[PDB]
């Protein structure tokens, strides 16, 4: 999975893949497949099914999950898991010169960080994060605008989907010029 | 085991610009 965002002085852009993977089978087997998938080892959807067969894990892949949206001028990106009855979730809130990060601890979406000014934020496994970070640093220039950031994030999303089967080729992009306070949105989410 | 993100487990990458 991968959610990436660029926060600038005049707005913010956010992109997310649409892949959702469910695993079914014994825990040591699922854990072995997961490690291979989140390491960049499995590149194609063909190699993923061959590996699931090998480890005796049934895998369903769904490529229509909207991971980014825009509520009140604030962009919201989310990555989530399910493991041993534990639901884990991380959200990114972004607007012009504004950002916040919150995690689902138990039943409450809890703010873990925030910042002002310009930033690039990548949400993903260690592999997808290093690849997107490398693509961003390679193409971003100091005086680049929000429009250049759109092209860059598209290139990041395409480069990652070419290297791993943990991300889908299809992706979404939301953008805003609004400077609405993201902390307001994180408070609204805090309960439920 | 719903979803393919280590993004929930692995920590988010934050780069200052």
Numbering used by the authors:
A (entry chain A): 1 to 192
B (entry chain C): 4 to 20
Sentences copied from the publication:
The discovery of peptide ligase activity in the Connectase family of enzymes (CETs) from archaea has expanded protease repurposing strategies. However, original CETs exhibit significant residual protease activity, leading to nonprocessive (reversible) ligation and limiting their application. In this study, we present crystal structures of a highly active protein ligase from Methanococcus maripaludis (MmCET) in both its apo- and substrate-bound forms. By determining the crystal structure of MmCET, both with and without a preferred peptide substrate at its catalytic transition state, we uncovered the essential elements responsible for the high-precision substrate recognition of N-terminal motifs.
The resulting structure at ∼2.1 Å resolution revealed the atomic details of how MmCET formed intricate interactions with its preferred substrates. Given the overall elongated shape, its recognition by MmCET can be likened to the jaw of a crocodile biting a buffalo leg. Notably, the C-terminal substrate pocket of MmCET exhibits relatively loose interactions with the bound peptide. In contrast, the N-terminal substrate recognition groove features opposite side chains that form specific interactions with the substrate. Overall, the N-terminal substrate recognition groove (reading the P4′–P13’ residues from the substrate) forms a set of highly specific interactions, resembling the shapes of “teeth” inside the crocodile jaw, that only permitted binding of substrates with a well-defined combination of amino acids. The peptide bond after the aspartic acid residue at the P1 position could be attacked by threonine 1 from MmCET (note that the T1A in the actual crystal structure renders the enzyme inactive), forming a transition state complex in which the C-terminal substrate is directly linked to Thr1 of MmCET via a peptidyl bond, while proline at the P1’ position is cleaved. Indeed, by observing the conformation of a peptide substrate captured in our complex structure, we noticed that the Pro-Gly-Ala sequence at the P1′–P3′ positions is highly unstable (orange color) based on its bond angle constraints.
